[PDB]
Ligand binder design. Structure first.
Ligand code: HEM
Length: 153
């Protein structure tokens, strides 16, 4: 569990991801798609995209970024108590989208990368540590639901 000090670091930095949701969203997913191209095979809708310029041009992608970041944000603000917001996500990514838990590790990487890219200033080592910790907690609790369902962590 994170301390109050550590949640304050995470949300104090999210309050500025929240400043431009759509720019952040778009950087994160392009980062994911280029570092692990096998993830793009999960969206039939983004399979046509083949270059980064195509990715940056897609209004559909940008729209999926806002979705991902709005869901994430809602979980983060619930701090240590986020089971209401977490469960539907894990059932759908587990059972609908067939997303392995390894990809959520990939996208947390993506997320920390971009935050450091856009905020070499609120995202020092202490804030990097908090954020790591919040994302592992996210992954841990997801993997627990996956386990239950037979997809397990
Ligand atoms: C930070 C982690 C993630 C968040 C917060 C997130 C959240 C969401 C949300 C809210 C939706 C729409 C409603 C629902 O189906 O739950 C969604 C759909 C989807 N997600 Fe995620 N997601 C995450 C990670 C990913 C990853 C890593 C994959 C793929 C490698 C993935 C693949 C998809 C696909 C296939 C859809 C269905 C809609 C579409 O075709 O884009 N998601 N996700």
């Amino acid at each position: 569990v994170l301390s109050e000090g550590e949640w304050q670091l995470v949300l104090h930095v999210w309050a500025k991801v929240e400043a431009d949701v759509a720019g952040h969203g778009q950087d994160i997913l392009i980062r994911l798609f280029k570092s692990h191209p096998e993830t793009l095979e999960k969206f039939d809708r983004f399979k046509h995209l083949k270059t980064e310029a195509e990715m940056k041009a897609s209004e559909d992608l940008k729209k999926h970024g806002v979705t991902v970041l709005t869901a994430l944000g809602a979980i983060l603000k619930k701090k240590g108590h986020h089971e209401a917001e977490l469960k539907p996500l894990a059932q759908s990514h587990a059972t609908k989208h067939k997303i392995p838990i390894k990809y959520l590790e990939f996208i947390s990487e993506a997320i920390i990368h971009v935050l450091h890219s856009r905020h070499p200033g609120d995202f020092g080592a202490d804030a990097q540590g908090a954020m790591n910790k919040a994302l592992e907690l996210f992954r841990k609790d997801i993997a627990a639901k996956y386990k239950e369902l037979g997809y397990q962590g």
